[PDB]
């Protein structure tokens, strides 16, 4: 059975396997075709719950187009023991908003079930992550885990065939909002997260993974990849959603209504 935030033992720096990962859900979306193409990561709730980014899915908002996968660590074949799953719901924050650069309310959930009707199964390569609780979240200058199939560096047209991960530095709300970073367009709703340094990062193709932290022993999904001006830039932190501001929203969203 499931126990959330254990596993069984990107212009950052390293290639991972997916039980380094076992919440990473990757989000593709079925063409014409198919020719299923990749679309946003996501994190595993529960057995039925994936959730990831808004921004993601508003091009295309038809449920019936999606395919999610767990316990895979490649973009375009196979991981022993990956599990294949279809979107029955479809939820996207009412509040979205976006201007040019930051994605308010930059969240979505995901309700999956297979071709056989089932929900997901826990193993070596699938688990849940633990939500924040109301309230608490890290403090800054944690170090936090960023995993994604994104851009290995910010002018590729190629993404990576092996998933990635890197470690990032929590910035605080009041120097992210300093003029030669974010300025006001960062809110706190959100929270930057950059490496000291500037060598390591989240880019296209990452938004919606997990920001992962430990608080207080458990592995627990405290963002999820927003936005950011450019990738590996000085003074330009990626920016994530801060999941504990949301639980309202998931809880009313996620256990009945
Ligand atoms: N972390 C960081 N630093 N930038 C980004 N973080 C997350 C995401 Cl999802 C993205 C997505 C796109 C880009 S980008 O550089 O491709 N891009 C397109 C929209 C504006 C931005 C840009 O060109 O500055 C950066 C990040």
């Given at each position: 059975k499931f126990?959330?935030?254990?596993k ?15 919440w ?5 979306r079925?063409?014409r075709?198919?020719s ?9 709730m529960s057995?039925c719950?994936?959730i990831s ?5 508003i091009?295309?908002?038809?449920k019936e ?5 767990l ?5 375009n074949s ?18 979205y908003?976006?201007?040019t650069?930051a994605?308010?309310?930059?969240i ?11 929900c997901?199964?826990?193993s070596?390569?699938?688990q849940?992550?633990?939500l924040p609780?109301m ?14 199939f994104?851009?290995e560096?910010?002018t590729d ?8 991960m890197?470690?990032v ?9 300093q003029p030669?970073?974010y300025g006001?367009?960062v809110?706190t709703?959100?929270l ?5 340094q ?6 296209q ?5 997990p920001?992962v ?5 458990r ?9 950011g001006?450019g990738?590996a830039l000085?003074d ?7 999941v ?5 929203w ?6 009945e209504?």
């Amino acid at each position: 059975k499931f126990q959330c935030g254990q596993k069984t033992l990107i212009i950052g720096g390293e290639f991972t396997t997916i039980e380094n990962q076992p919440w990473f859900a990757a989000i593709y979306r079925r063409h014409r075709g198919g020719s299923v193409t990749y679309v946003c990561g996501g994190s595993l709730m529960s057995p039925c719950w994936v959730i990831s980014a808004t921004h993601c899915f508003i091009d295309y908002p038809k449920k019936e187009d999606y395919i999610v996968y767990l316990g895979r660590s490649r973009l375009n074949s196979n991981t022993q023991g990956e599990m294949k799953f279809e979107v029955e719901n479809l939820i996207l924050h009412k509040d979205y908003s976006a201007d040019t650069l930051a994605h308010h309310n930059d969240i979505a959930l995901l309700k999956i079930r297979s071709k056989e009707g089932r929900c997901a199964q826990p193993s070596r390569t699938i688990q849940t992550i633990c939500l924040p609780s109301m309230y608490n979240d890290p403090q800054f200058g944690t170090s936090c885990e960023i995993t994604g199939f994104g851009k290995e560096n910010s002018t590729d047209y190629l993404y990576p065939e092996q998933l990635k991960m890197t470690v990032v530095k929590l910035i605080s709300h009041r120097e992210c909002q300093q003029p030669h970073y974010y300025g006001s367009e960062v809110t706190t709703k959100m929270l930057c997260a950059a490496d000291p340094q500037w060598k390591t990062d989240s880019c296209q193709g990452d938004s919606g993974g997990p920001l992962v932290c430990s608080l207080q022993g458990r592995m627990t999904l405290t963002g999820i990849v927003s936005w950011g001006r450019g990738c590996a830039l000085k003074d330009k932190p990626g920016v994530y959603t801060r999941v504990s501001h949301f639980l309202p929203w998931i809880r009313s969203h996620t256990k009945e209504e």
